[PDB]
Design a protein around this motif. Structure first.
Motif, PDB file in Angstrom:
ATOM      1  N   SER A   1       5.131  38.545  32.385  1.00 20.48           N
ATOM      2  CA  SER A   1       6.687  38.452  32.212  1.00 20.48           C
ATOM      3  C   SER A   1       7.504  38.393  30.526  1.00 20.48           C
ATOM      4  CB  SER A   1       6.373  36.941  32.094  1.00 20.48           C
ATOM      5  OG  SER A   1       6.934  35.825  32.405  1.00 20.48           O
ATOM      6  N   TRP A   2       8.542  38.412  30.933  1.00 21.38           N
ATOM      7  CA  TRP A   2       9.765  39.106  30.310  1.00 21.38           C
ATOM      8  C   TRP A   2       9.581  37.454  28.630  1.00 21.38           C
ATOM      9  CZ3 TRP A   2      14.180  36.996  28.543  1.00 21.38           C
ATOM     10  CH2 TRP A   2      14.548  37.103  27.147  1.00 21.38           C
ATOM     11  N   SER A   3       9.316  37.850  27.506  1.00 18.75           N
ATOM     12  CA  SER A   3      10.054  36.425  26.477  1.00 18.75           C
ATOM     13  C   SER A   3       9.810  36.361  25.533  1.00 18.75           C
ATOM     14  CB  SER A   3       8.740  35.614  26.612  1.00 18.75           C
ATOM     15  OG  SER A   3       8.986  33.796  26.439  1.00 18.75           O
ATOM     16  N   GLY A   4      10.991  36.788  25.060  1.00 13.08           N
ATOM     17  CA  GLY A   4      12.000  37.228  23.684  1.00 13.08           C
ATOM     18  C   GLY A   4      11.327  38.200  23.022  1.00 13.08           C
ATOM     19  N   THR A   5      10.966  37.904  21.413  1.00 12.59           N
ATOM     20  CA  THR A   5       9.667  38.857  21.050  1.00 12.59           C
ATOM     21  C   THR A   5       8.355  39.079  22.001  1.00 12.59           C
ATOM     22  OG1 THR A   5       8.601  36.459  19.618  1.00 12.59           O
ATOM     23  CG2 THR A   5      10.705  38.167  19.047  1.00 12.59           C
ATOM     24  N   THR A   6       7.918  38.901  22.714  1.00 12.21           N
ATOM     25  CA  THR A   6       7.049  38.996  23.309  1.00 12.21           C
ATOM     26  C   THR A   6       7.136  39.392  24.923  1.00 12.21           C
ATOM     27  OG1 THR A   6       6.433  36.852  24.956  1.00 12.21           O
ATOM     28  CG2 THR A   6       6.222  37.617  22.252  1.00 12.21           C
ATOM     29  N   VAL A   7       6.428  40.286  25.692  1.00  9.84           N
ATOM     30  CA  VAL A   7       6.366  40.555  26.805  1.00  9.84           C
ATOM     31  C   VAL A   7       4.590  39.990  27.687  1.00  9.84           C
ATOM     32  CG1 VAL A   7       6.551  42.022  29.174  1.00  9.84           C
ATOM     33  CG2 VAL A   7       8.204  41.883  26.832  1.00  9.84           C
ATOM     34  N   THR A   8       4.532  38.880  28.597  1.00  6.43           N
ATOM     35  CA  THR A   8       3.054  38.498  28.607  1.00  6.43           C
ATOM     36  C   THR A   8       3.224  39.719  29.956  1.00  6.43           C
ATOM     37  OG1 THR A   8       3.205  36.459  27.703  1.00  6.43           O
ATOM     38  CG2 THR A   8       1.731  37.134  29.077  1.00  6.43           C
ATOM     39  N   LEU A   9       2.019  40.226  29.617  1.00  4.26           N
ATOM     40  CA  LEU A   9       0.620  41.067  31.309  1.00  4.26           C
ATOM     41  C   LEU A   9       0.153  40.047  31.960  1.00  4.26           C
ATOM     42  CD1 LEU A   9       0.097  43.328  32.807  1.00  4.26           C
ATOM     43  CD2 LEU A   9      -1.736  43.616  31.206  1.00  4.26           C
ATOM     44  N   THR A  10       0.207  39.896  32.913  1.00  7.86           N
ATOM     45  CA  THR A  10      -0.465  38.461  33.785  1.00  7.86           C
ATOM     46  C   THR A  10      -1.494  39.540  35.015  1.00  7.86           C
ATOM     47  OG1 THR A  10       1.071  36.898  33.525  1.00  7.86           O
ATOM     48  CG2 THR A  10      -0.481  36.185  35.264  1.00  7.86           C
ATOM     49  N   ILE A  11      -2.766  38.948  35.286  1.00  5.06           N
ATOM     50  CA  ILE A  11      -3.372  39.597  35.872  1.00  5.06           C
ATOM     51  C   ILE A  11      -4.075  38.744  36.133  1.00  5.06           C
ATOM     52  CG2 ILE A  11      -5.394  41.564  35.646  1.00  5.06           C
ATOM     53  CD1 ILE A  11      -4.398  42.867  33.394  1.00  5.06           C
ATOM     54  N   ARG A  12      -3.630  38.711  37.785  1.00  4.49           N
ATOM     55  CA  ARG A  12      -4.474  37.987  38.565  1.00  4.49           C
ATOM     56  C   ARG A  12      -5.841  38.524  40.195  1.00  4.49           C
ATOM     57  NH1 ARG A  12       1.144  37.334  38.962  1.00  4.49           N
ATOM     58  NH2 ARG A  12       1.056  39.210  40.465  1.00  4.49           N
ATOM     59  N   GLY A  13      -6.566  37.853  39.454  1.00  4.94           N
ATOM     60  CA  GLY A  13      -8.175  38.575  40.670  1.00  4.94           C
ATOM     61  C   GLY A  13      -9.088  39.524  39.717  1.00  4.94           C
ATOM     62  N   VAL A  14      -9.318  38.789  38.681  1.00  9.14           N
ATOM     63  CA  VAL A  14     -10.424  39.950  37.864  1.00  9.14           C
ATOM     64  C   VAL A  14     -11.941  40.053  38.580  1.00  9.14           C
ATOM     65  CG1 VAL A  14     -11.592  40.510  35.510  1.00  9.14           C
ATOM     66  CG2 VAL A  14      -9.113  39.201  36.346  1.00  9.14           C
ATOM     67  N   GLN A  15     -11.576  41.442  39.147  1.00  5.21           N
ATOM     68  CA  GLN A  15     -12.857  41.891  40.012  1.00  5.21           C
ATOM     69  C   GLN A  15     -13.091  43.399  38.699  1.00  5.21           C
ATOM     70  OE1 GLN A  15     -14.258  41.990  43.570  1.00  5.21           O
ATOM     71  NE2 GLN A  15     -12.972  39.891  43.339  1.00  5.21           N
ATOM     72  N   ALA A  16     -14.347  42.677  38.702  1.00  3.85           N
ATOM     73  CA  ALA A  16     -15.295  43.361  37.628  1.00  3.85           C
ATOM     74  C   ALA A  16     -14.962  45.607  37.639  1.00  3.85           C
ATOM     75  CB  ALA A  16     -17.009  43.656  37.934  1.00  3.85           C
ATOM     76  N   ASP A  17     -14.285  45.378  38.774  1.00  9.39           N
ATOM     77  CA  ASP A  17     -13.839  46.774  38.930  1.00  9.39           C
ATOM     78  C   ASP A  17     -12.790  47.521  38.039  1.00  9.39           C
ATOM     79  OD1 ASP A  17     -15.087  47.591  40.808  1.00  9.39           O
ATOM     80  OD2 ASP A  17     -13.729  46.658  42.976  1.00  9.39           O
TER      81      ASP A  17
END
Lengths: 41, 53, 205, 227
Positions: free
Chosen positions: C56-72
């Protein structure tokens, strides 16, 4: 981004009825419009 | 001008219909003209040589 | 310098966010990569036009969102875009995604003696590798008959494997006489304080 | 898209280094930008430069006046050049494919970046003066008593790395190879392991093929059981 030459504008107008009015958005080239003086208006 | 334009019909009358730029469809490209450079430089050399005289 | 976290944390099931901040993110779209330690950085974020992974883009930042954190998905993640002059690219830091709730593992120790040939080389070495343990921290005890070893030994840092468990390596260099001498060499690996043993002699097929 | 870098991986201090990357097996490649990305051991992947087939190359700022990217587009085998080298540039070097996707015509640039979707196997690059030492390969014979396992001990080589496979490729499922030992001599060493149960340790052909690309050797060696 990758700027943009045009603008996603919006402003105020009237409608079929007299009392009640209407806002609506359009897209203009930055040549067709110009600034005036908060964001840039 | 590779853009599918949408005509927004705005009631500002009665009767009077204003047209606003409907949401331009997707990918954004500006107007252009593909000029055949072969035909361009052809008429270029023809007239230029009428001028050293 | 692209401003990422070098590591982020999350528990078995939750979602997470990695924020790559800086200046040029108000101008160029952001692309991301997944480098499992030593692998080929996999591309996951693109601009296909003007499922579980997004940013998600947000100004001075772009935030990487990760959904479903399997240990893989335990890996180093890298944000990368372009500066405002469209000449050069460069990368950020490298975010190690930690996956909590991974189980502890008592060690899997192997042991091999000097080979049928190596004795001829004035080399009488021992091979005691430790495979697939959690957490990645142990300490080895080399032995002979019933006595330990403090030198002629080298040990390499534990390495993370496919199942996110660790593997440490250790070897010991002897001469042909210091090998065939003693009746029971015994590599020993202390894991969790608990320890596992493998014993080897020059006198048993 | 095979990215077969045909290179050495070792060079002397203050001299020069050249790499290659044989681009093979493809059907839409030169659309995209051919780049080189490096990672110091456990550090940040850092961009070096890329090449657009037409010759429009770009370079990382503090490197631009030393790095060059060539193009043998006939093979096609594109190459890279670095100069005045020190040990600080030692690490992993990944050739990659900076993708480009277009809806229209190039002249107006109707395209964006997709990203580096093809990273090669890579070449470990080292700067020193120790020579190209081939490996002393050993066969780890298994026990005479179900399951079982055997491997191959790669001893005293320089520099990193080597690798292996068993029965020249047929042994795969459930194998391990463990980090190398940099002994006080300055040479590394490590072993491979492959699983072979006690039903065909005496009815199959199970080798271990050692390749040390830093010293152009392909060490074919066989591993047999123990009395």
């Amino acid at each position: 981004i990758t700027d943009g030459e045009l603008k996603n504008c919006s402003f105020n107008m009237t409608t079929e009825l007299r009392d009640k009015k209407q806002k609506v958005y359009s897209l203009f080239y930055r040549l067709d419009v110009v600034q005036i003086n908060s964001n840039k208006e | 001008r590779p853009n599918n334009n949408t005509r927004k019909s705005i009631r500002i009358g009665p009767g009077q219909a204003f047209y606003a730029t409907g949401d331009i469809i997707g990918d954004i490209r500006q107007a252009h003209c593909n000029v055949s450079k072969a035909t361009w430089n052809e008429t270029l050399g023809k007239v230029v040589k009428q001028l050293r005289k | 310098e692209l401003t990422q976290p070098p590591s982020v944390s999350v528990s078995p099931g939750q979602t997470a966010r990695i924020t790559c901040s800086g200046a040029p993110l108000t101008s160029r779209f952001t692309y991301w990569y997944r480098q499992k330690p030593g692998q080929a950085p996999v591309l996951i974020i693109s601009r296909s036009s003007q499922g579980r992974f997004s940013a998600s883009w947000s100004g001075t930042t772009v935030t990487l969102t990760i959904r479903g954190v399997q240990a893989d998905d335990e890996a180093d993640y890298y944000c990368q875009s372009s500066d405002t002059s469209d000449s050069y690219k460069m990368f950020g830091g490298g975010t190690k995604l930690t996956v909590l709730g991974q189980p502890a593992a008592a060690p899997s120790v192997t042991l091999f003696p000097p080979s049928s040939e190596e004795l001829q080389a004035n080399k009488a070495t021992l091979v005691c590798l430790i495979s697939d343990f959690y957490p990645g921290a142990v300490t080895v005890a080399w032995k002979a008959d019933s006595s330990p070893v403090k030198a002629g030994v080298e040990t390499t840092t534990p390495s993370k494997q496919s199942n996110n468990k660790y593997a440490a390596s250790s070897y010991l260099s002897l001469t042909p006489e210091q090998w065939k001498s003693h009746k029971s060499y015994s590599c020993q690996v202390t894991h969790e304080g608990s320890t596992v043993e493998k014993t080897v002699a020059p006198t048993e097929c | 898209v095979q990215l077969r870098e045909s290179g050495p991986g070792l060079v002397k201090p203050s001299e020069t280094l050249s790499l290659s990357c044989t681009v093979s097996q493809d059907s839409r490649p030169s659309d995209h930008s051919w780049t080189w990305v490096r990672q110091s051991p456990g550090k940040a992947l850092e961009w070096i430069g890329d090449i657009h087939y037409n010759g429009a190359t770009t370079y990382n700022p503090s490197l631009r006046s030393r790095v060059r990217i060539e193009l043998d587009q006939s093979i096609p085998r594109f190459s890279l050049k670095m100069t005045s080298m020190t040990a600080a540039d030692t690490g992993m070097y990944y050739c990659a494919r900076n993708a480009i996707r277009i809806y229209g015509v190039v002249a107006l640039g109707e395209w964006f970046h997709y990203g580096m979707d093809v990273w090669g196997q890579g070449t470990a690059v080292t700067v020193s003066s120790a020579s190209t030492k081939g490996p002393s390969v050993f066969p780890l014979a298994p026990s005479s008593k179900g399951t079982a396992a055997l491997g191959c001990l790669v001893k005293d080589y320089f520099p990193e790395p080597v690798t292996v496979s068993w029965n020249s490729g047929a042994l795969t499922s459930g194998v391990h190879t463990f980090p190398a030992v940099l002994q006080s001599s300055g040479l590394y060493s490590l072993s491979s392991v492959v699983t072979v149960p006690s039903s065909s340790l005496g009815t199959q052909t199970y080798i271990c093929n050692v390749n040390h690309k830093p010293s152009n050797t392909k060490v074919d060696k066989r591993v047999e059981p123990k009395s």
